[PDB]
């Protein structure tokens, strides 16, 4: 009994017996251990890497975000475009495009004007999807810092630094999303999978 | 991340231990020494 | 073309510009980063991860 107890305790008290409060080597060794633990825990929840799998919950960032990319399709279909106002504006467009001439073939600019109006609507669900994902990431960072409780002032700083970074990346992520929609308005490519010939 | 954390000033206060750990390691040292003495006495009794 | 090239140099020379022959803080963070690099690289070579 006593032999077993010494073996269990020995691996740790080997270090405690040499403690000196003025020991930069210990502080820096502790720093590298906490940072390596956080980066392993963080990757585990997002990427799924490692052999420690949580079989009770959903993984957090990994599968909450994976589902944000499958709630988002729902946001893109709640548009409710009024058919009657389309058919009116199509009619007025054709007549105004022909103008002073009677017209001989269906115009193209009518097709381009209608699409541009609907494409401009997508901006709303796209800026929601970004805010949803930012919120989920901040959550997973706050779970990962629960393991640094024995070090106050290091759980605060690591939260602040990783949190600030994720927020500042919001601006650049939204600009690219906006730009990818302007690209869609700029040119109407009808040689794609479309009603060719019709 | 590691370079950012290290670069902050007052490294002696960033990594300060909580009072609970000072108690935990002090107790484990007393437990460790006490176990050795007890195992010494048993060895000197079996004889 | 010049601006593209200068971007590949700034990330590194920001450490050199403040170089001193005797800087314990510089050495300490150089040790830690190199220890972390080795452990990650080694595990990657045998485990097959990443």
Q: What is the DSSP letter of A101?
A: S
**CA atoms of A17 and A90, how far apart (whole Å):** 85
**CA atoms of A130 and A148, how far apart (whole Å):** 29
The alpha-carbon gap from A43 to the nearest alpha carbon of chain C, in Å, equals 11
B21-27: long-range pairs with CB below 8 Å, 24+? B21/A150, B25/A13, B25/A16, B25/A19
For residue C31, which of A148, A18, A158, B3 has the smallest C-alpha distance?
B3
**CA atoms of A148 and A158, how far apart (whole Å):** 9
In chain A, which among 8-37 make CB contacts under 8 A with chain B?
A: 9-10, 12-13, 16-17, 19, 24, 27-28, 30-32, 35
Give Cα A27 distance to the centre of its chain. Answer: 35
CB-based contact A71:A181 (threshold 8 Å)? no
**CA atoms of A171 and A178, how far apart (whole Å):** 11
Query: Quick one: which H or E segment has residue A71?
Result: helix A61-75
Count of beta carbons in the 10 Å neighbourhood of residue A38: 21
For residue B15, which of A153, A39, A32 has the smallest C-alpha distance?
A153
**Residue A109: is it exposed, middle or buried by C-beta count within 10 angstroms (0-12/13-18/19+)?**
exposed
**Cβ contact, residue pair B7, C29, below 8 Å:** yes
| Residue A112, phi-psi category: left (phi > 0), alpha (psi -120 to 50), beta (remainder) | alpha
Residue B30, token pair as written in the block: 């007393």
Cα nearest neighbour of A3 on chain B: B39
Experimental method: cryo-EM
**Residue A15: is it exposed, middle or buried by C-beta count within 10 angstroms (0-12/13-18/19+)?**
exposed
Q: Which of A10, A39, A154 sits opposite B14 (nearest CB)?
A: A154
**CA atoms of B11 and A28, how far apart (whole Å):** 9
**Cβ contact, residue pair B2, A31, below 8 Å:** yes
Is residue A88 helix, strand or coil? Answer: helix
Give Cα A119 distance to the centre of its chain. Answer: 22
Q: Which residues of C touch A28 (CB under 8 A)?
A: 28, 32
**CA atoms of A72 and A64, how far apart (whole Å):** 12
Number of residues assigned to chain C: 50
Q: What is the CA radius of gyration of chain C?
A: 16
**CA atoms of A144 and A42, how far apart (whole Å):** 6
Measured in Å, how far apart are chain A's first and last C-alpha atoms?
Answer: 87
Cα nearest neighbour of C25 on chain B: B7
Compute the count of residue pairs across chains A and C with CB atoms less than 8 Å apart: 10
**Cβ contact, residue pair C33, B7, below 8 Å:** no
Q: Which residues of A touch B8 (CB under 8 A)?
A: 157
Give the orientation angle of helix A123-144 with respect to helix A61-75, to 10 degrees.
170
**CA atoms of A95 and A89, how far apart (whole Å):** 10
Quote the longest CA-to-CA distance of chain B.
61
Q: What is the CA radius of gyration of chain B?
A: 20
CB-based contact A65:A132 (threshold 8 Å)? no
Whether A86 and chain B come into contact, CB under 8 Å, resolves to no
DSSP for chain C, written as a single string: -HHHHHHHHHHHHHHHTT--SS-HHHHHHHHHHHHHHHHHHHHHHHH---
**CA atoms of B22 and B3, how far apart (whole Å):** 28
Q: Which of A28, A38, A153 sits opposite B13 (nearest CB)?
A: A153
């Amino acid at each position: 009994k006593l032999q077993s107890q010494l073996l269990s305790i020995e691996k740790e008290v080997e270090e405690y017996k040499n403690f000196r409060p003025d020991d930069p080597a210990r502080k820096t060794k502790a720093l590298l251990q906490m940072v390596q633990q956080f980066a392993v825990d963080f990757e585990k929840r997002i990427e799924g890497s490692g052999d420690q799998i949580d079989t009770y919950e959903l993984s957090g960032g990994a599968r909450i975000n994976r589902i944000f990319h499958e709630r988002f399709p729902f946001e893109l279909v709640k548009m409710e475009f009024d058919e009657k106002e389309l058919r009116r504006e199509i009619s007025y467009a054709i007549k105004n495009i022909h103008g002073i001439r009677t017209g001989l073939f269906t115009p193209d600019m009518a097709f381009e004007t209608i699409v541009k109006k609907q494409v401009k609507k997508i901006r709303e669900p796209c800026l929601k999807c970004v805010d949803m994902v930012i919120s989920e990431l901040i959550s997973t960072v706050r779970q990962c810092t629960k393991k640094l409780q024995q070090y106050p002032r290091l759980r605060e700083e690591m939260e602040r630094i990783v949190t600030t970074h994720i927020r500042e990346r919001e601006g650049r992520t939204k600009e690219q999303v906006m730009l990818l929609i302007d690209i869609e308005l700029a040119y109407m490519n009808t040689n794609h999978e479309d009603f060719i010939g019709f | 991340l590691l370079a950012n954390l290290y670069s902050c000033g007052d490294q002696n206060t960033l990594m300060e231990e909580s009072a609970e750990q000072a108690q935990r390691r002090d107790e484990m040292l007393r437990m460790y020494h006490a176990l050795k003495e007890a195992l010494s006495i048993i060895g000197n009794i079996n004889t």
